[PDB]
Amino acid sequence: VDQRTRDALQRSVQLAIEITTNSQEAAAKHEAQRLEQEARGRLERQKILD
Amino acid sequence: QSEAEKARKELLELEALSMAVESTGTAKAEAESRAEAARIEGEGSVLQAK
């Protein structure tokens, strides 16, 4: 019935949206770090062989 | 890092071979030069004594 409860629920849903976006960003960052580490290791081994 | 060390073992073996070659070459060159000089001096000394 009250509008203030609706406002609170709107803030809750916006926080949930922010949570989802932050989760996707963290997953992308972790994948990028893994790929960078793999590339660095391969480069170091190739330097040793050279 | 384990793979890098695996390559580094062979690299160090090759470096050890190169270092041994360089050291023995320098030592044998200096020793042979001094020996040849001593032999020539000895023959000259024999002739001078005569």
UniProtKB/Swiss-Prot annotation, chain A:
Q: What is known of its domains?
A: MVP 3 mediates interaction with PTEN.
Localization of this protein:
Cytoplasm; Nucleus, Nuclear pore complex; Cytoplasm, Perinuclear region
Q: What does this protein do?
A: Required for normal vault structure. Vaults are multi-subunit structures that may act as scaffolds for proteins involved in signal transduction. Vaults may also play a role in nucleo-cytoplasmic transport. Down-regulates IFNG-mediated STAT1 signaling and subsequent activation of JAK. Down-regulates SRC activity and signaling through MAP kinases.
Q: How is it modified after translation?
A: Phosphorylated on Tyr residues after EGF stimulation. Dephosphorylated by PTPN11.
Recorded superkingdom: Eukaryota
Which organism is the protein's source? Homo sapiens (Human)
| Induction field | Up-regulated by IFNG/IFN-gamma.
Cite the record's tissue specificity text: Present in most normal tissues. Higher expression observed in epithelial cells with secretory and excretory functions, as well as in cells chronically exposed to xenobiotics, such as bronchial cells and cells lining the intestine. Overexpressed in many multidrug-resistant cancer cells.
| Descriptive protein name | Major vault protein
**Subunit arrangement?**
The vault ribonucleoprotein particle is a huge (400 A x 670 A) cage structure of 12.9 MDa. It consists of a dimer of half-vaults, with each half-vault comprising 39 identical major vault protein (MVP) chains, PARP4 and one or more vault RNAs (vRNAs). Interacts with TEP1. Interacts with PTEN and activated MAPK1. The phosphorylated protein interacts with the SH2 domains of PTPN11 and SRC. Interacts with APEX1. May interact with ZNF540.
* Disulfide topology: none
